[PDB]
């Protein structure tokens, strides 16, 4: 049993963990489903960021409890809710082919989403590497030591769960970026629809064979939009509340013995 | 009771190559009741009969009736089977038969004979005569066309336009725009088709207005005035139908 070990472990557990990312994920294009995915990630990252601050307050309380446990062997306004779910559209309504094309290729095409995914995946890896703060004691033994080891273990398991959720949001943003490049590949490019409209305008003599291509060009666009409405609907990330740290109150002053010779 | 054969005759006549010239999504549907009343409907817009086309004396157009609510007219837009059904529904009659080609007929079968047409069953000559389009959709307007002497034909129309120059036949574009939602089966293609057809209606009307105000021939402005009055009716019906479903 040693007091300076406890006093050091308290400072170690109270110390700053990784800074979570703060940059917002911007929608890859101007389609409604893309914006809905980006806004869901905005809400998920905001709620996660609040819950990580709550875990920081819990580690502060655990450090205070460790200091009071060390003094026993000598002398030294809202709460966390769930994440809101962006309401997403079902099968999409009719949209003009030129308009769908013009919206699909207006934006950063997934750069902000990739930066979001990079930041949250790095954050994942940093919290994973920072779990030696919650290991057992070398010299400190007994009932209070076992209770403190249990509290540290609960904080370790919560931190690892938080890392898994950070990885999940990163993979969500990555998925919407891949879905957008598939949509850019499969949907008719704007130059082709404007050129087709102009080629009907040049020879209305070809008007009886331009219409089966446009229907073809419509149908695809519509597969794209249906899939982009269905697959860019992201589940909100609901983190668990951080477990309460053990509360150890300050002890009464120690009785000096050998007193009264 | 009789004239099922006359119904299939006119049903073959609409289905000729005279006016079914590669229009994507255009088809006709002909139907007759137990009374013997003949009703037709196409799949382009509301109260549309093509240019210079006539219908026989018994024939009612389904999308052109006044005893039928405009909201259930617009509900049946571009879906001509449902149109002749709704015509029979409020007009109290039971449909004896529906004629056409079975691709068009795959939608509905409530006690209907489902008459199928083949490439020999349809002759490729239209050859039918009857009422001009103004007399089919607006016989009130066709009667005050007929009491107008050939000099006073400008009393039916609004004044001569402030532009003396012709407006420009952009109709080959607006028609195209019109055919664009007909390549879709998404919810809301009906309404977009009706908006593009309303723009085609208004431009056609302005062209007929200028055509009557610039010509000096009897039959020529009678064509132009009848065209103007027809597109006046069509623009009004499309505006009411687009407005009633917001």
Numbering used by the authors:
A (entry chain A): 9 to 84, 113 to 297
B (entry chain B): 484 to 729
Article sentences:
Mycobacteria have up to five specialized secretion systems (ESX-1 to ESX-5) that transport virulence factors across their complex cell envelope to facilitate manipulation of their environment. One of these substrates, the ESX-1 secretion-associated protein B (EspB; Rv3881c), has been postulated as a structural component of the extended ESX-1 machinery. Once secreted across the inner mycobacterial membrane, EspB oligomerizes into a cylinder-like heptamer, favored by the removal of its C-terminal region and the acidic pH environment of the phagosomal lumen. EspB interacts with EspK (Rv3879c), which is encoded by a gene in the RD1 locus downstream of EspB.
This improved the crystal diffraction and led to a final anisotropic resolution of 2.3 Å. The structure resembles a sea snail, consisting of two domains. The shell consists of an antiparallel β-sheet with five peripheral α helices. The foot of the snail is formed by a compact helix bundle of three α helices with a loop containing three short helices connecting the foot with the shell. The interaction occurs between α6–7 and the PE-PPE loop of EspB and α9–10 of EspK. Analysis of the EspB-EspK interface by PISA gave an interface area of 652 Å2, ΔG of -11.7 kcal/mol, and a relative low complexation significance score of 0.1. The EspB–EspK interaction could be abolished by either shortening an amino acid side chain of EspK through a K663A substitution or by changing the hydrophobicity of a side chain through a F659D substitution in EspK, indicating that both residues are essential for complex formation. EspK binding to EspB prevents EspB oligomerization not only by steric hindrance but also by locking the PE-PPE loop, preventing it to adapt the more open conformation that is required for EspB oligomerization.
